[PDB]
Amino acid sequence: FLQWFSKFLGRIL
């Protein structure tokens, strides 16, 4: 559920 790209800051899984 990232805005730009995959990142731990978001909800990437």
Side-chain angles (χ1 to χ4, degrees):
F1 301 89
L2 273 290
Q3 195 189 101
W4 275 318
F5 294 112
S6 64
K7 206 82 80 74
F8 306 125
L9 282 155
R11 205 84 81 184
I12 190 62
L13 292 168

